[PDB]
Write an enzyme that holds these catalytic residues in place. Structure first.
Site, short mmCIF file in Angstrom:
data_model
loop_
_atom_site.label_atom_id
_atom_site.label_comp_id
_atom_site.label_asym_id
_atom_site.label_seq_id
_atom_site.Cartn_x
_atom_site.Cartn_y
_atom_site.Cartn_z
NE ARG A 1 -7.22 6.13 8.48
CZ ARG A 1 -6.88 7.23 8.16
NH1 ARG A 1 -7.38 8.37 8.47
NH2 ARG A 1 -5.78 7.19 7.26
CE1 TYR B 1 -3.07 5.35 -7.41
CE2 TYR B 1 -1.69 3.31 -7.47
CZ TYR B 1 -2.88 4.04 -7.94
OH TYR B 1 -3.64 3.74 -8.69
CG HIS C 1 -1.89 1.12 1.32
ND1 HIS C 1 -3.11 0.87 0.64
CD2 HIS C 1 -1.79 2.30 1.91
CE1 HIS C 1 -3.93 2.06 0.81
NE2 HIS C 1 -3.28 2.90 1.31
N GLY C 2 1.12 1.93 -1.12
CA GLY C 2 1.88 3.09 -1.08
C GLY C 2 0.94 4.36 -0.90
CB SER D 1 1.90 0.10 -4.05
OG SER D 1 0.93 -0.68 -3.75
CD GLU E 1 -6.38 -0.61 -9.52
OE1 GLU E 1 -7.16 -0.13 -8.56
OE2 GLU E 1 -5.82 -0.11 -10.40
C1 LIG Z 1 -5.42 9.89 -2.20
C2 LIG Z 1 -6.46 9.43 -1.00
C3 LIG Z 1 -5.73 8.42 -0.23
N1 LIG Z 1 -5.58 7.04 -0.56
C4 LIG Z 1 -4.32 6.43 -0.81
O1 LIG Z 1 -3.17 7.05 -0.26
C5 LIG Z 1 -4.34 5.02 -1.29
C6 LIG Z 1 -3.28 4.98 -2.71
C7 LIG Z 1 -3.19 3.96 -3.29
N2 LIG Z 1 -3.94 3.53 -4.26
C8 LIG Z 1 -3.89 2.47 -4.76
C9 LIG Z 1 -4.71 1.98 -5.82
C10 LIG Z 1 -4.55 0.63 -6.50
C11 LIG Z 1 -3.68 -0.21 -5.97
C12 LIG Z 1 -2.67 0.12 -5.21
C13 LIG Z 1 -2.59 1.53 -4.47
C14 LIG Z 1 -1.93 1.93 -3.50
O2 LIG Z 1 -1.02 1.33 -3.08
N3 LIG Z 1 -2.26 3.14 -2.87
C15 LIG Z 1 -6.45 8.59 1.07
C16 LIG Z 1 -5.70 9.28 2.15
C17 LIG Z 1 -6.45 9.41 3.24
C18 LIG Z 1 -7.59 8.74 3.52
C19 LIG Z 1 -8.18 7.85 2.49
C20 LIG Z 1 -7.61 7.71 1.32
#
Ligand SMILES: CC[C@H](NC(=O)CCc1nc2ccccc2c(=O)[nH]1)c1ccccc1
Length: 354
Positions: free
Chosen positions: A222, A247, A206-207, A244, A336
């Site tokens: 969350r 991101y 999870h990046g 990942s 994903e």
């Molecule tokens: C940009 C909004 C952020 N979400 C993330 O940082 C997750 C990003 C992410 N997306 C993916 C999508 C498909 C596959 C892998 C990933 C992943 O590793 N990170 C977030 C930040 C705070 C609360 C909820 C969500």
């Protein structure tokens, strides 16, 4: 009179991490990268109420996008009044597509976690009365209520993690591993124990933005009311580091670029495989515990190994990605992995990469 500052208990790596994830520069950098006006929205002025008003304005925009109601222009203007943006003192653009609406929801989710980190740092009255205080970095570590242990080269899992990173990261510019910490956020333990019957556990990447690392260490991964993406309203993981790492918003520090990535243990159970985007999903179909948007490629399953975490076997991929002919027509280049209950993931490792 003058309080004693006790000496820092933390090793250098952990000190740097804690400095980075609470850095006001880092937070303001992140806000600037999201086009926010930091001069009109300083860190100490961010409020939960302001953020809630921002979501309400986007909720109104979304209704308009699906009357004789207010135009997208007027409703956009309201959003921009509530959440000040910087576009070189030109007009900010109208939020007039699903993609842009989601982009603004995502910005606000990041901003809500910056606000969380600020609220967390509020000085309590006990701390105002004791005559000795922890070193500021010990204090900030303690606020997380999350145990971090820096691993060295001969921790049992170290080579397995390094191999996962190397074999599934970019071929030409693989992120360079600097440190690995084991992560034990207690309070995750009880809910995760709920799924101990559920097999099919996998360690997955999870990046994220550096700016949400403190929040994640405090509260775990969350699902929020406005979360979404190509596979709906869940928590997203990848089996390929390179997916990942896309991101990961790192920060320039000295001559290099510092970033953080997590590894979570995910109880996937019975998988439902899809091969086309479904942004409307909020759970797997009945009888399934997860949804996997299957990529053209997958880390070579024949090279999967296992770790033992809290007496359970957890699959860890170790192979380079290979083509999966059944998914050659998938709308996804890389997989994903989605869960739709926060209880099905436990944070296990945090990595610093350059
Ligand atoms: C940009 C909004 C952020 N979400 C993330 O940082 C997750 C990003 C992410 N997306 C993916 C999508 C498909 C596959 C892998 C990933 C992943 O590793 N990170 C977030 C930040 C705070 C609360 C909820 C969500």
């Amino acid at each position: 009179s003058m309080k004693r500052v006790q000496p820092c208990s933390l090793d250098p790596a952990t000190q740097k991490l804690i400095t980075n994830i609470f850095s006001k520069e880092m937070f303001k950098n992140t806000m600037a990268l999201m086009d926010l006006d930091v001069k009109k929205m300083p860190l100490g002025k961010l409020s939960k109420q302001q953020i809630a008003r921002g979501f309400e304005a986007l909720e109104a925009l979304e209704e308009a996008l699906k009357d004789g109601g207010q135009s997208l222009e007027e409703l956009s203007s309201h959003f921009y009044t509530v959440i000040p943006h910087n576009f070189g003192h030109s007009q900010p653009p109208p939020i007039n597509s699903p993609e842009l609406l989601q982009a603004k929801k995502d910005m606000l989710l990041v901003l809500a976690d910056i606000e969380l980190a600020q609220a967390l740092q509020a000085v309590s009255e006990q701390e105002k009365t004791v005559e000795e205080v922890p070193h500021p970095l010990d204090r900030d570590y303690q606020l997380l209520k999350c145990q971090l242990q820096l691993l060295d080269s001969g921790a049992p899992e170290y080579k397995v993690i390094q191999t996962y990173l190397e074999q599934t990261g970019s071929n030409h510019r693989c992120p360079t591993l600097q440190h690995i910490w084991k992560v034990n956020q207690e309070g995750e333990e009880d809910r995760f124990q709920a799924h101990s019957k559920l097999g099919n556990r996998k360690l997955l990447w999870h990046g994220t933005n550096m700016a949400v690392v403190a929040a994640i260490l405090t509260s775990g991964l969350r699902i929020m009311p406005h979360s979404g993406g190509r596979v709906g309203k869940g928590i997203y993981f990848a089996s390929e580091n390179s997916k990942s790492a896309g991101y990961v918003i790192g920060m320039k520090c000295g001559a290099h670029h510092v970033g953080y990535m997590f590894l979570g243990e995910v109880a996937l159970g019975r998988e439902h495989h899809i091969n086309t985007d479904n942004p409307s999903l909020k759970s797997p179909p009945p009888g399934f515990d997860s949804v996997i948007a299957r990529g053209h490629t997958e880390p070579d399953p024949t090279q999967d190994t296992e770790l033992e975490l809290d007496g359970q076997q957890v699959v860890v991929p170790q192979g380079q990605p290979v083509p999966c002919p059944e998914f050659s027509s998938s709308t996804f280049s890389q997989s994903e992995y989605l869960i739709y209950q926060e209880s099905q993931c436990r944070l296990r490792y945090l990595l610093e990469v350059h």
